[PDB]
């Protein structure tokens with residue numbers, strides 16, 4: 001039971017409203033959610049197909065998303081991800097505070113901050 005579970009419906013709502021025929025931001029982001037310092041759930045934010053889906057726990061790549069296809073990955077506490085998703089903080093602020101680990105293209109998360117704020 002994650003705080004993040006409480007906000008998934010609202011995020012799916014916002015994804016459903018994105019226009020499908022004029023696509024410009026199509027990154028694949030892996031998100032590894034922590035509770036008490038260990039990864040307890042992993043999800044993919046798939047901006048190509050515009051979906052969020054659960055993946056195998058803590059994995060680096062999958063058959064559908066091989067390594068060369070993943071743009072960036074973030075390890076983040078469940079509570080902090082819920083705060084970003086509810087627009088109470090940003091990825092930029094969490095990076096400034098040392099609260100997250102990001103591999104791959106860090107700029108993808110900073111750009112996501114900017115796109116999400118208008119949605």
Ligand SMILES: CCCCCCCCCCCCCCCC(=O)O
Pocket residue numbers: 011014015018022023024025026045084085112115116119
């Ligand atoms: C911070 C968590 C975000 C999770 C997903 C939020 C749902 C909408 C996010 C913004 C959608 C970006 C739209 C890009 C459209 C495009 O130009 O291709």
